[PDB]
């Protein structure tokens, strides 16, 4: 994608050496901010091929507030078992902040469904968030949220959302990160009767590890395809009935796939 | 400042008339991002003269874990009281959660002093975070934070950060608030023996409301003056132990200020 590419070229060009918690080495800059009108299509890169069975099983797993990667395996997607235990847990990762972020005076808040209940009575509302960054269940988590807070806004029916990432692994993160939020805006904007707006992305530490080089150039030297389009044959009664199928992504001819070390 | 009247051109021209839970209607654009690099100055808006002795006090305010008014009154600062209940409560707001956040088991997290911690010992940390939008608490809140989730990050020794705000009123707030955190950003570096890096603005619903068109139309038409310097005269052994003389700025010279009413 334009914005993708141009975000890589970035890097490169004005990014700072930097080692990290992996121990890989990285090229870092710090604050970004890009735009995708969804309507233009769904953002799904082309340069390279991603896997969607990945993606969409991700979100569906974060929607369900599920924190263990059983759900995950059953349907082939091995994405997060490098952070896994012995039992398949993750801690209170996205899933768990999002359904069920524990209150001190023993409650429970569950965003997801705050969200659509403000989206369709106060969509004028400027507190329509949902935050996975738990400080007080950090210590618990097998990885700190890398999208970490997120908000949308309404405008002429068209639903709209932000989301701020702290730590973006652009070679191979960001293009799932991406996928993954355009589909859930889609699937909000279908609940609440509204048109897909825009997805704006913002970064904090955004980097390229220092063996993902090589591909990063690869990739860089391809022209980004048209962009694929969404067709959701169904609508459920809740946000929470999605399934796999109820998903068709038409017209997706992206150029071949490119592998790379997963830092851990 | 030249970002600062470009952001408030936009939103007179892209602007979205919206009908606000005040009721004064505003103006609005979603997402939004800018950067000030320190090392040029002190980004104190000159179009307007600003209120400083209440931007300090209100930071020192924040640092010392203080949710009630009653410090800001001891100095002359007015900018919290149509918001505190009958004793000056505003509810666990910032400074609560950025110093003690109360985790769901009695224990308290004070994110500053986690901070200052890993500025020190792993600056090359990608979770420098801190955040005041505890989902667990906002009801007990006078006011859902609205700069609520900032990070700090390290490069070439220099101290940048990020802010991003969920709401902002671009004529009365913006300017506050981008001044607030610059001056953090001093104040944590000094600290650390570091070098004042970037301050990069991140907005959710940018917004100028409707009976300030008048105000800003004034301030559109008036030319940016050299941004000034702030001098830190002393240096404590703490970031909690600072004091309002501590602070100077040099070379400001504004124009004149604009009066102009708060939306409640
Ligand atoms: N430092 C990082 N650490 C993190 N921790 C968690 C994350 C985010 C989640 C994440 C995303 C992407 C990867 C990743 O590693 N991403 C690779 C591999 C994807 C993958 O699993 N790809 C799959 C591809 C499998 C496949 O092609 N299946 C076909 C077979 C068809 C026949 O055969 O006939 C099918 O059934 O459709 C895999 O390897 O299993 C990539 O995107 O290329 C890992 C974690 C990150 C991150 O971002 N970066
Ligand atoms: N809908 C909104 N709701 C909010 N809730 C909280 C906020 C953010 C905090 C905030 C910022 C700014 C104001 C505001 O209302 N901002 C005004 C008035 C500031 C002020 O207190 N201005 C002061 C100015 C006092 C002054 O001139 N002092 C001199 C005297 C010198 C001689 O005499 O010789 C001196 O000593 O330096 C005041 O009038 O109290 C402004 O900037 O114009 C209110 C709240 C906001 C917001 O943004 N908008
Ligand atoms: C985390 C999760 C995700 O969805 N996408 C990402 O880009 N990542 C990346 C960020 C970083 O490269 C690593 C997490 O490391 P750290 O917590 O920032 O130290 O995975
Ligand atoms: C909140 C506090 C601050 O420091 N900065 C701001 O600009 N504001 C403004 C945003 C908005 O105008 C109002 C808060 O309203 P809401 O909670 O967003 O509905 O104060």
Not at 118 to 126: A, E, G, H, I, W
Not at 153 to 174: E, I, N, T
Request: glycine share 6%; hydrophobic share 35%.
């Amino acid at each position: 994608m334009k914005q993708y590419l141009e975000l890589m070229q970035k890097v490169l060009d004005e990014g700072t050496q930097k080692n990290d918690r992996t121990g890989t080495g990285t090229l870092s800059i710090f604050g970004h901010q890009m735009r995708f009108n969804l309507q233009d299509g769904f953002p799904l890169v082309t340069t390279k091929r991603c896997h969607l069975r990945s993606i969409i099983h991700e979100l569906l797993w974060f929607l369900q507030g599920d924190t263990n990667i059983a759900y995950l395996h059953e349907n082939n997607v091995t994405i997060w078992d490098e952070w896994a235990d012995e039992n398949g847990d993750l801690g209170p990762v996205y899933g768990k902040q999002w359904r069920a972020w524990p209150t001190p005076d023993g409650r429970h808040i569950d965003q997801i469904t705050t969200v659509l209940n403000q989206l369709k009575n106060d969509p004028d509302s400027r507190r329509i968030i949902v935050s996975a960054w738990n400080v007080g269940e950090l210590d618990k988590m097998a990885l700190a949220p890398c999208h970490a807070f997120f908000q949308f806004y309404v405008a002429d029916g068209k639903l709209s959302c932000q989301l701020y990432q702290r730590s973006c692994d652009v070679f191979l993160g960001l293009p799932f990160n991406i996928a993954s939020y355009a589909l859930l805006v889609h699937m909000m904007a279908q609940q609440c009767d509204l048109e897909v707006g825009d997805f704006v992305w913002t970064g904090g530490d955004t980097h390229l590890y220092s063996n993902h080089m090589d591909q990063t150039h690869l990739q860089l030297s391809r022209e980004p395809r048209p962009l694929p389009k969404l067709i959701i044959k169904r609508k459920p009664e809740s946000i929470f009935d999605y399934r796999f199928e109820d998903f068709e992504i038409e017209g997706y001819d992206p150029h071949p796939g490119i592998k790379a070390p997963v830092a851990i």
